[PDB]
Design a protein around this ligand. Sequence first.
Ligand SMILES: C=CC1=C(C)/C(=C/c2[nH]c(/C=C3N=C(/C=C4\NC(=O)C(C)=C4C=C)C(C)=C\3CCC(=O)O)c(CCC(=O)O)c2C)NC1=O
Length: 381
Amino acid sequence: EDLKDDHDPFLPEDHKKALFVYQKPALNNINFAFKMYRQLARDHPTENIVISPVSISSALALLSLGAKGHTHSQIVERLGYNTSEIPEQQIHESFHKQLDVVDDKDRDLEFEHGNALFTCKEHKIHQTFLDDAKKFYHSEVIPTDFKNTEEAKNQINSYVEKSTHGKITNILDSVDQDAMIALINFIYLRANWQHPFDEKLTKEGDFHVDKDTTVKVPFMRRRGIYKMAYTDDIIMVTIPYNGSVEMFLAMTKMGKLSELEQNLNRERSLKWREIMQYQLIDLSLPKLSVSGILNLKETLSKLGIVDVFSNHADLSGITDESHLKVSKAIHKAMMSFDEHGEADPLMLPPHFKFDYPFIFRVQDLKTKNPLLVGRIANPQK
Ligand SMILES: C=CC1=C(C)/C(=C/c2[nH]c(/C=C3N=C(/C=C4\NC(=O)C(C)=C4C=C)C(C)=C\3CCC(=O)O)c(CCC(=O)O)c2C)NC1=O
């Protein structure tokens, strides 16, 4: 052992970690995210998609607190929960914990979230629903007058503006004068890179919207070690944020993204997780500020959640109005990419440039819940 060094000086950093342990609520929310995104990707073929699956699941679980009978059990089941395995109050506790761990400010996270139910002023909301909506979901039930449509538009939008600190200024264009309950759910996420980008290295480049459409956007560029994988047909990278959150990105050749989106599930995700390795790469990301607005009635109905939006909804846990139903259900999510949320290598590293339509997934590493997923089809909205 006449070795020049007592340890191999070329060996890269060790990156082993313990096995990801999952709680059953997180697994249900993860599988619901896949189911919902695949359908959304079918129904909106060309646009940007930005949704928070855990926040949609949370809003419906809150709605189930005010539901009874088949209306209640259908929501719980279609969210992926089996009440023969999980007591119902552990579901509400799990969504409560997710709010607390994200709102923990010793955690460095720029994740603003909000959920509110706007109801008719002339009807009294049950106190037990008011109590649990505030306790478990930090959600307000706000009286409104929908017969005067224009004040509700300004009021709902101003509420969203206030709770997002002006980041989401508009969520509702108009509301029917016969509305009973309006579910309003919104998310803003700014990527707070664990390793920020240098603004000096940001350059304008081509983003290819489709086989014949190209737009000019600023591209951030950084050289570093990232967990990655690539073939001739796909590249994928995991980018850590601060505060125990990681963003996964995947990109295919032009026009093949749909083939990827319609094949996503957890089992295939875990297989790719084992293939990916930490490698030195050049990473190019478009500067970006993209929005997605979701009509939750049409989307959730295709997923089997129908009663709560129907003329036979049993929402007597909220109010004793005869035919109370959720008339409007909106989910708006915003995501922003900016810069701040050395000798030459022997070989030029592979350049992971995301200048083609790509999909993204933001995951809370403490809970494993999907905080945000979607598709960047055009970083210019
Ligand atoms: C068929 C190919 C296929 C690929 C390439 C794939 C990749 C993939 N998905 C993952 C996780 C994940 N992927 C998602 C979800 C999504 N992923 C998205 O990019 C989008 C838009 C969604 C939409 C719902 C979720 C929820 C996880 C976490 C799964 C878990 O931790 O159990 C990971 C792990 C990332 C990491 O550990 O750092 C990879 C590699 N998934 C697949 O099924």
